[PDB]
Design a protein around this ligand. Structure first.
Ligand code: NI
Length: 341
C-alpha cells in the first residue's frame, strides 16, 4: 500500500504513487518527472487525473500512451489551482521536464516536494524565498559526506575539449555517448555543437528527444548514422566489444571511436580531480568515465536545506533500511544544530 511519504497531508494528493493500483482517498496524482521508478504503473489503462509539466505530459502521451483526457500539464513558476489547492511547479535541475512542487495548504502550511533534484544556489532566489516552508520531502540520493562531485559545467568543458582534440587529430574518428533514459542530454548536444554535427541515434530515442521542447531540435539530431560524427547508444553497449561491433555497422565511414560513459558516482570520486582523468584504451577504441550527476552532492543538499530551514524533513530515497533511515536522521539533526533552526 501507498507509503506515508508519497501522500500530502490535508489534500487529496499523491506524488509519484502509481504502482499501488487505486489509492483510497487520492483525488489527484502528481508526477514529478519521467523516470520509470517514479512513473511505474502508469499506462493507457490509467483513468484518473495526472498533473505534471508540459514535457512530462508529452512523454506520457507519446511513450506510455496515456490518453489525453487524463493529462493536465501545468506551466512553471505560475500560481495554479488544483482541486481547491494553490500549487506551483519549479524547475528541479534534474532531467528534462523534472519539477519540484510547492503546495499551499488550506490551514496555512506550506510543503515543498523536491522530486528528484540537483540543488543549486539559483533556487535560493526563486518563489521559495517568498515564505516559510514547513515540511520538505527531500531527494536524499547522496545524503552522505563521501559523495562529492564536480559541477556539470566542469565535466562538459572536459568532454568538449577532449572530443575536439581527438577528431581534429583524426577526422575519421567517431564520438559515442552512452544513455539509458532521459537526462544528461547536455553531454552529447554540447559535444555535437563544438564539432558542428548532428547527433545520430535510433528511431526510439529520436522520438523521445522530439518530446522535450528543445528549441531548434530538428537542426540538432538525426537517425542517419553515416552523416553524423556523434552517435548515441545504450549505456550497456559502451564496452570494447559493443563499440567494435557498432563501428562495423557504420559502413566504413570511421576507423576509430572515443566514447563517454556519464555515470553517477562510483568509488573513484574521492581522489581523482577532473583534470587527472585518463581513458581506458584497447587498440582504436577509447572509453572515458565522467561523473555527470543530476542529483545533489552532499554539500549542495546541506546548503539548500540550511537555507530553507524546514520545520520537518521527510526523505524520499534510501528509506527502505533502518540503517539508512537512522544515518540520514543524524545528518538532519546536525544541519539543524549548526544553523540554529
Ligand atoms: Ni530521476
Amino acid at each position: 500500500t501507498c507509503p506515508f511519504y508519497k501522500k500530502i497531508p490535508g489534500t487529496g494528493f499523491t506524488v509519484d504513487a502509481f504502482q499501488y493500483g487505486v489509492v483510497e482517498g487520492c483525488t489527484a496524482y502528481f508526477l514529478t518527472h519521467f523516470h520509470s521508478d517514479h512513473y511505474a504503473g502508469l499506462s493507457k489503462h490509467f483513468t484518473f487525473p495526472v498533473y505534471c509539466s508540459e514535457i512530462t505530459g508529452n512523454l506520457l502521451k507519446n511513450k506510455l500512451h496515456v490518453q489525453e483526457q487524463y493529462i493536465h500539464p501545468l506551466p512553471l513558476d505560475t500560481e495554479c489551482i488544483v482541486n481547491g489547492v494553490k500549487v506551483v511547479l519549479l524547475d528541479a535541475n534534474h532531467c528534462p521536464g523534472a519539477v519540484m512542487i510547492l503546495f499551499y495548504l488550506p490551514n496555512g502550511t506550506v510543503i515543498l516536494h523536491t522530486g528528484d533534484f540537483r540543488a543549486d544556489p539559483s533556487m535560493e532566489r526563486s518563489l521559495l524565498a517568498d515564505q516559510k516552508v514547513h515540511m520538505l520531502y527531500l531527494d536524499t540520493t547522496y545524503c552522505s559526506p563521501e559523495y562529492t562531485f564536480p559541477s556539470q559545467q566542469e565535466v562538459i568543458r572536459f568532454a568538449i575539449n577532449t572530443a575536439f582534440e581527438a577528431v581534429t587529430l583524426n577526422p575519421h574518428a567517431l564520438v559515442v555517448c552512452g544513455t539509458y533514459s532521459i537526462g544528461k542530454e547536455k553531454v552529447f548536444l554540447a559535444i555535437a555543437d563544438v564539432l558542428g554535427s548532428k547527433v545520430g541515434m535510433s528511431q526510439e530515442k529520436y522520438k523521445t528527444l522530439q518530446c522535450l521542447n528543445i528549441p531548434e531540435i530538428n537542426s540538432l539530431i538525426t537517425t542517419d548514422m553515416c552523416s553524423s560524427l556523434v552517435h548515441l547508444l545504450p549505456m550497456m553497449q559502451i564496452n570494447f566489444k559493443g563499440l567494435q561491433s557498432h563501428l562495423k555497422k557504420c559502413g566504413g565511414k570511421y576507423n576509430q571511436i572515443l566514447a563517454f560513459r556519464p555515470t553517477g558516482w562510483t568509488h573513484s570520486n574521492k581522489f581523482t580531480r577532473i583534470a587527472d582523468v585518463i581513458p581506458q584504451t584497447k587498440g582504436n577504441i577509447s572509453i572515458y568515465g565522467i561523473p555527470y550527476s543530476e542529483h545533489s552532492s552532499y554539500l549542495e543538499m546541506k546548503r539548500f536545506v540550511q537555507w530553507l530551514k524546514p520545520q520537518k524533513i521527510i526523505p524520499t530515497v534510501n528509506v527502505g533500511t533502518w540503517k539508512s533511515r537512522s544515518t540520514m536522521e543524524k545528518y538532519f539533526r546536525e544541519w539543524k544544530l549548526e544553523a540554529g533552526y
